[PDB]
Amino acid sequence: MNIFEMLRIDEGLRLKIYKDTEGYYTIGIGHLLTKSPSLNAAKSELDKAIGRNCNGVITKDEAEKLFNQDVDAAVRGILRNAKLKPVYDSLDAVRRCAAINMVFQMGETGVAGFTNSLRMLQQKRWDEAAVNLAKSRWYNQTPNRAKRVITTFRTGTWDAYKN
Protein backbone atom coordinates (compact mmCIF):
# COMPACT_ATOMS: atom_id res chain seq x y z
CA MET A 1 0.00 0.00 0.00
CA ASN A 2 1.01 3.59 -0.80
CA ILE A 3 -0.70 6.97 -0.92
CA PHE A 4 -1.99 6.42 -4.45
CA GLU A 5 -3.66 3.10 -3.62
CA MET A 6 -5.02 4.54 -0.37
CA LEU A 7 -6.64 7.56 -1.99
CA ARG A 8 -7.83 5.50 -4.96
CA ILE A 9 -9.75 3.36 -2.47
CA ASP A 10 -11.13 6.38 -0.63
CA GLU A 11 -12.03 8.41 -3.72
CA GLY A 12 -12.99 5.81 -6.33
CA LEU A 13 -12.74 6.48 -10.06
CA ARG A 14 -15.40 8.17 -12.18
CA LEU A 15 -14.75 9.37 -15.74
CA LYS A 16 -17.68 11.82 -15.97
CA ILE A 17 -18.34 14.88 -13.82
CA TYR A 18 -19.97 13.89 -10.54
CA LYS A 19 -20.73 15.57 -7.24
CA ASP A 20 -18.60 14.90 -4.18
CA THR A 21 -19.99 14.30 -0.70
CA GLU A 22 -20.38 18.09 -0.23
CA GLY A 23 -22.28 18.49 -3.50
CA TYR A 24 -19.39 19.99 -5.50
CA TYR A 25 -18.54 19.12 -9.10
CA THR A 26 -15.65 16.66 -9.22
CA ILE A 27 -14.16 14.16 -11.67
CA GLY A 28 -11.71 11.30 -11.81
CA ILE A 29 -10.14 10.18 -8.54
CA GLY A 30 -11.67 12.89 -6.38
CA HIS A 31 -10.46 15.88 -8.42
CA LEU A 32 -12.48 18.90 -7.30
CA LEU A 33 -13.46 21.07 -10.25
CA THR A 34 -15.34 23.94 -8.62
CA LYS A 35 -17.54 24.87 -5.70
CA SER A 36 -19.71 26.90 -8.08
CA PRO A 37 -23.22 25.52 -8.73
CA SER A 38 -22.65 26.11 -12.47
CA LEU A 39 -21.98 22.92 -14.42
CA ASN A 40 -20.59 25.10 -17.21
CA ALA A 41 -18.05 26.53 -14.76
CA ALA A 42 -17.06 22.97 -13.82
CA LYS A 43 -16.71 22.00 -17.49
CA SER A 44 -14.47 25.02 -18.08
CA GLU A 45 -12.26 24.01 -15.15
CA LEU A 46 -12.08 20.49 -16.56
CA ASP A 47 -11.05 21.62 -20.03
CA LYS A 48 -8.37 23.88 -18.52
CA ALA A 49 -7.08 21.01 -16.36
CA ILE A 50 -6.91 18.47 -19.20
CA GLY A 51 -5.92 20.79 -22.05
CA ARG A 52 -8.72 19.84 -24.44
CA ASN A 53 -12.47 20.25 -24.87
CA CYS A 54 -13.78 17.37 -22.73
CA ASN A 55 -17.52 17.87 -22.61
CA GLY A 56 -17.41 16.65 -18.97
CA VAL A 57 -15.78 13.28 -19.75
CA ILE A 58 -12.16 12.13 -19.41
CA THR A 59 -10.17 8.94 -19.96
CA LYS A 60 -8.67 6.75 -17.25
CA ASP A 61 -5.17 7.91 -18.23
CA GLU A 62 -6.26 11.53 -17.81
CA ALA A 63 -7.89 10.76 -14.45
CA GLU A 64 -4.68 9.11 -13.25
CA LYS A 65 -2.55 12.02 -14.45
CA LEU A 66 -4.73 14.56 -12.64
CA PHE A 67 -4.55 12.30 -9.60
CA ASN A 68 -0.74 12.25 -9.64
CA GLN A 69 -0.70 16.04 -9.88
CA ASP A 70 -3.20 16.38 -7.03
CA VAL A 71 -1.25 14.06 -4.70
CA ASP A 72 1.98 15.92 -5.47
CA ALA A 73 0.29 19.26 -4.83
CA ALA A 74 -0.89 18.04 -1.42
CA VAL A 75 2.64 16.91 -0.52
CA ARG A 76 4.30 20.11 -1.71
CA GLY A 77 1.73 22.18 0.18
CA ILE A 78 2.49 20.31 3.41
CA LEU A 79 6.20 20.87 2.86
CA ARG A 80 5.71 24.61 2.26
CA ASN A 81 3.52 25.06 5.36
CA ALA A 82 5.46 26.01 8.49
CA LYS A 83 2.81 24.46 10.73
CA LEU A 84 2.37 21.20 8.82
CA LYS A 85 5.93 20.37 7.77
CA PRO A 86 7.35 19.72 11.28
CA VAL A 87 4.52 17.32 12.09
CA TYR A 88 4.75 15.57 8.71
CA ASP A 89 8.51 15.15 9.09
CA SER A 90 8.01 13.58 12.52
CA LEU A 91 5.80 10.80 11.09
CA ASP A 92 6.66 7.41 9.68
CA ALA A 93 5.81 6.66 6.06
CA VAL A 94 2.43 5.03 6.70
CA ARG A 95 1.23 7.87 8.89
CA ARG A 96 2.53 10.39 6.35
CA CYS A 97 0.05 8.81 3.90
CA ALA A 98 -2.76 9.49 6.39
CA ALA A 99 -1.61 13.12 6.57
CA ILE A 100 -1.59 13.48 2.79
CA ASN A 101 -5.02 11.86 2.67
CA MET A 102 -6.49 14.51 4.98
CA VAL A 103 -4.86 17.38 3.06
CA PHE A 104 -6.13 15.90 -0.21
CA GLN A 105 -9.67 15.79 1.17
CA MET A 106 -9.88 19.09 3.05
CA GLY A 107 -6.91 21.19 1.91
CA GLU A 108 -4.48 23.10 4.08
CA THR A 109 -7.28 25.43 5.21
CA GLY A 110 -9.51 22.48 6.11
CA VAL A 111 -6.80 21.08 8.40
CA ALA A 112 -6.09 24.47 10.03
CA GLY A 113 -8.51 23.58 12.83
CA PHE A 114 -6.65 20.36 13.67
CA THR A 115 -3.86 22.11 15.65
CA ASN A 116 -4.46 20.03 18.77
CA SER A 117 -4.59 16.79 16.76
CA LEU A 118 -1.33 17.74 15.04
CA ARG A 119 0.34 18.34 18.41
CA MET A 120 -0.76 14.92 19.67
CA LEU A 121 0.50 13.30 16.45
CA GLN A 122 3.88 15.03 16.78
CA GLN A 123 4.00 13.80 20.40
CA LYS A 124 3.21 10.28 19.11
CA ARG A 125 0.23 10.03 21.45
CA TRP A 126 -1.63 7.94 18.93
CA ASP A 127 -4.74 6.93 20.88
CA GLU A 128 -5.26 10.48 22.13
CA ALA A 129 -4.77 11.83 18.62
CA ALA A 130 -7.32 9.34 17.28
CA VAL A 131 -9.88 10.44 19.88
CA ASN A 132 -9.23 14.10 19.08
CA LEU A 133 -9.37 13.62 15.28
CA ALA A 134 -12.88 12.14 15.57
CA LYS A 135 -14.19 15.28 17.31
CA SER A 136 -14.59 16.98 13.97
CA ARG A 137 -17.04 17.85 11.24
CA TRP A 138 -14.80 15.71 9.02
CA TYR A 139 -15.46 12.57 11.05
CA ASN A 140 -19.18 13.26 11.38
CA GLN A 141 -19.70 13.92 7.68
CA THR A 142 -17.47 11.13 6.25
CA PRO A 143 -17.18 8.69 9.16
CA ASN A 144 -16.13 5.56 7.31
CA ARG A 145 -13.33 7.31 5.47
CA ALA A 146 -12.31 9.23 8.60
CA LYS A 147 -12.28 5.98 10.58
CA ARG A 148 -9.88 4.45 8.04
CA VAL A 149 -7.57 7.45 8.15
CA ILE A 150 -7.74 7.62 11.96
CA THR A 151 -6.98 3.90 12.28
CA THR A 152 -3.94 4.52 10.06
CA PHE A 153 -2.75 7.27 12.42
CA ARG A 154 -3.58 5.16 15.49
CA THR A 155 -1.75 2.01 14.38
CA GLY A 156 0.78 3.01 11.74
CA THR A 157 -0.47 0.04 9.69
CA TRP A 158 -2.55 -0.44 6.57
CA ASP A 159 -5.04 -2.61 8.49
CA ALA A 160 -8.04 -0.37 7.72
CA TYR A 161 -7.38 -0.61 3.97
CA LYS A 162 -6.60 -4.32 3.89
CA ASN A 163 -9.76 -4.98 5.89
For ligand Fc1cccc(I)c1, the binding residues (CB under 6 A) are: 78, 84, 87-88, 99, 102-103, 111, 114, 118, 121
Residue 48 C-beta: closest distance to ligand Fc1cccc(I)c1, Å:
27
Residue 102 C-beta: closest distance to ligand Fc1cccc(I)c1, Å:
4
d(CA 163, CA 1): 12
CB of 58 or CB of 87, closer to ligand Fc1cccc(I)c1? 87
Residue 122 C-beta: closest distance to ligand Fc1cccc(I)c1, Å:
8
CB atoms within 10 A of CB 22: 10
Task: Say if CB 28 and CB 66 are below 8 A apart.
Answer: yes
d(CA 17, CA 11): 14
